[PDB]
């Protein structure tokens, strides 16, 4: 059985690095992370110092 | 990193109050709740006494 | 077996009351109405006197 | 010909009042506003004092 | 309040049995599981021995 | 001209049999049923005895 | 209250005429038809003599 | 950079002519119109004399 | 088994004729073309002489 | 690089067997078939003898 | 009240830089730009010299 | 007439480079490649050595 958690990663650099940010967090706290599906992307502007790219992913992990 | 939990709140009063019901539950058990996105709304009729409005939300919270 | 009818209710008050308007109509003419799913919402402006909130619902009823 | 502008209204009270907020703004600056279609709803939490309901609408107006 | 977890069940037999696989896992670890909504189906081929049917479900459970 | 009715069939056995349940009902009451399109699938759990698979279909029939 | 019926009109001429075909049928059998929304278009080829354009519409009518 | 404006054109003749109606309006008031994407089609019936076909388009234009 | 190819037809006349353009091409090179489903429509403006209507279709054909 | 072909399989038995029908055809003619994603399901009724279940899949295969 | 404008940015480098291109243009001409939501991405090939990455964003700005 | 092929490119570097990977493959085997539309993005994790970014594109090419 796989389960997915819905995470939004952030980066001041790129959409790819923002996806990595979310996956890194998942891998910190979950075993058997196997894939991620991008579900949205955006840019936070008017409450940060530098533009912040955001990539939201369903991160899938194998249960057990 | 933000994470979202997918909650359906309920109310005998309104769709807005049903959204509040879900957010209240999130705030009871989670720190740093920052926003909610409505993903569906409906009304339960034929297994309740009074119509029950339901509002399903992705409730976003900042991790750490 | 359930069947759904696609109804748009209206209200000069709120989206919740517009949903009730549709459900009330279904309950007038149908037995065993069991739930409703919101599929769209809108506001009619430039052919009514007061803004009219509209809520479109699939109203589900149990057949037999 | 109709044109639509994509506006997010806000309210500390309800999704309906947040929709009104957007429509009111459109009517302030546009002639012949004729309808609005709800495209999203959400709640801003962790950068406001009180929860703020938001309703995003395409507000349609007749050109000329 | 209901909460949903996003699970992908697997089966070498059918899409229905793959849905059961996910629900069974939810029922192992959660109380008050009340319904499941199918959100995707697929078949894993080129890293398994026999075709494996997969059914992804939002499994809803009542909180408390 | 074709018309469609939106029916949810149920089965304690499978998603395919739940689709048949809806189609059977359509064929009981309608002439010239010609096809069905699956629009959703789900499983009712916590108000039935055995899991009940549900398949919602637009059932198309030729008018006249 | 408005209700919608989901009709597929057909024409050997055009998508517009296929939409008219559905609306004409609605107007034959329903009072207070007020609008139609196109939901799909297609072309039937390999079971007709000439290509047949099809336009599927939700036809809305005012109840009462 | 391209920008899009969301326009609904109308015609008593066809969906194609309704799309032209919107594009013509864009070209009246905008320079460097480069393409249009159809996003919806419909027919206004019960507040016009003759059926009016409507085609909603995102009309893209190159900025500068 | 059916297979679909994703083709965009073009016409200086209409969306219907643009759909025919794609289907004609499919029929030139494929046997047993049986139906087409419209998936998008648009208009190319700023790199053609006359507006060019485009209709994108999944063209289905029976294999063997 | 992966490529996908869009195939509709058929079965007089089940949606799962209809998916297998499409995958079997892909495996007959393609090397390195690796997965399939269900994109639609339906039932052909009024031009076949027995109901025919259909499952449309994107069948993915690794290029080279 | 927030308003959104629908802009497609371009870059010969990356999808992230194409998003920046659109946001930069918005910030040139608008006050209080607060966020952007990616709605589409693509690559222009056969009318440019080098591949051009394009990222379409709804750029949100606070009115007043 | 344009045709599209549905390709998933891969890269250990970025979503942009994964899109290039797919386009490069199309250009190897097809003439008159004119544009690509991103339809999905993801990251393969638990069967590769380094995270592999994937970008799925419809690659459009002009027929003849
Ligand atoms: C990055 C980002 C910020 C946002 N802020 C937001 N802030 C807000 O008050 N309302 C919103 O709807 C909203 N949407 C956002 C979406 C994105 C993608
Ligand atoms: C409130 C609500 C109840 C429902 N009950 C339901 N009960 C059921 O047996 N099948 C369903 O598909 C179903 N859907 C529902 C959807 C909503 C929005
Ligand atoms: C309330 C409402 C009115 C509308 N009127 C409309 N009137 C019209 O001529 N064309 C339309 O597309 C249209 N859409 C509408 C949508 C909504 C939600
Ligand atoms: C109200 C609201 C705020 C938001 N803030 C947001 N803030 C953010 O940093 N990223 C987001 O994606 C985001 N989305 C939002 C969506 C909504 C509906
Ligand atoms: C079963 C299945 C396997 C998959 N594998 C996959 N493997 C991969 O490398 N990229 C993918 O996008 C991908 N998608 C899949 C989807 C499904 C439904
Ligand atoms: C089978 C089923 C039951 C459901 N019950 C439900 N019951 C409920 O109170 N709210 C819901 O949203 C809901 N959704 C359902 C969906 C499905 C598919
Ligand atoms: C016109 C048309 C015919 C079709 N026939 C069809 N026939 C069939 O056996 N399976 C299908 O999925 C199918 N889809 C169709 C869709 C359209 C739009
Ligand atoms: C042409 C058209 C008119 C409409 N009128 C409408 N009028 C209305 O009161 N409510 C609606 O939702 C609505 N929708 C419409 C949609 C279309 C496409
Ligand atoms: C006809 C048409 C042309 C287009 N050109 C385009 N040209 C471009 O540089 N970027 C685009 O996104 C784009 N989209 C188009 C869509 C359509 C429907
Ligand atoms: C099985 C099937 C047959 C169909 N036939 C069809 N036949 C037709 O004339 N028009 C259609 O739109 C159509 N759609 C279909 C869809 C499905 C899923
Ligand atoms: C970059 C891009 C160019 C395009 N050109 C295009 N050109 C065209 O003639 N028709 C189209 O549909 C089209 N779509 C496009 C989409 C994208 C994303
Ligand atoms: C990269 C990727 C791998 C995947 N693997 C997958 N593997 C699997 O067994 N089931 C899946 O649904 C699945 N989906 C995937 C999606 C993506 C985007
Ligand atoms: Cl989710
Ligand atoms: Cl419907
Ligand atoms: Cl828009
Ligand atoms: Cl496709
Ligand atoms: Mg930096
Ligand atoms: Mg988002
Ligand atoms: Mg914010
Ligand atoms: Mg009360
Ligand atoms: Mg729901
Ligand atoms: Mg129930
Ligand atoms: Mg009042
Ligand atoms: Mg509507
Ligand atoms: Mg009107
Ligand atoms: Mg107050
Ligand atoms: Mg939003
Ligand atoms: Mg076995
Ligand atoms: Mg999936
Ligand atoms: Mg049994
Ligand atoms: Mg459902
Ligand atoms: Mg003729
Ligand atoms: Mg259809
Ligand atoms: Mg047929
Ligand atoms: Mg005339
Ligand atoms: Mg519309
Ligand atoms: Mg001409
Ligand atoms: Mg297109
Ligand atoms: Mg048999
Ligand atoms: Mg289909
Ligand atoms: Mg360069
Ligand atoms: Mg686009
Ligand atoms: Mg071009
Ligand atoms: Mg490297
Ligand atoms: Mg994918
Ligand atoms: Mg895999
Ligand atoms: Na989730
Ligand atoms: Na219906
Ligand atoms: Na817009
Ligand atoms: Na394809």
Coordinates of C-alpha atoms in Angstrom, one line a residue, chain H residues 24-45:
Chain H
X24 CA -12.8 41.6 -33.4
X25 CA -13.4 43.5 -30.2
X26 CA -9.9 42.7 -29.0
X27 CA -8.4 43.8 -32.3
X28 CA -10.3 47.1 -32.0
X29 CA -8.6 48.0 -28.7
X30 CA -5.4 46.0 -28.6
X31 CA -2.3 45.8 -30.6
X32 CA -0.5 42.6 -31.4
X33 CA -3.3 40.1 -30.9
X34 CA -1.7 36.7 -31.7
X35 CA -4.1 33.9 -30.8
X36 CA -7.3 32.9 -29.0
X37 CA -8.2 29.8 -26.9
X38 CA -11.8 28.7 -26.6
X39 CA -12.7 28.2 -23.0
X40 CA -16.5 27.8 -23.1
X41 CA -19.5 27.9 -25.4
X42 CA -23.2 28.4 -24.7
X43 CA -26.5 29.6 -26.1
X44 CA -28.6 32.4 -24.6
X45 CA -32.3 31.7 -25.1

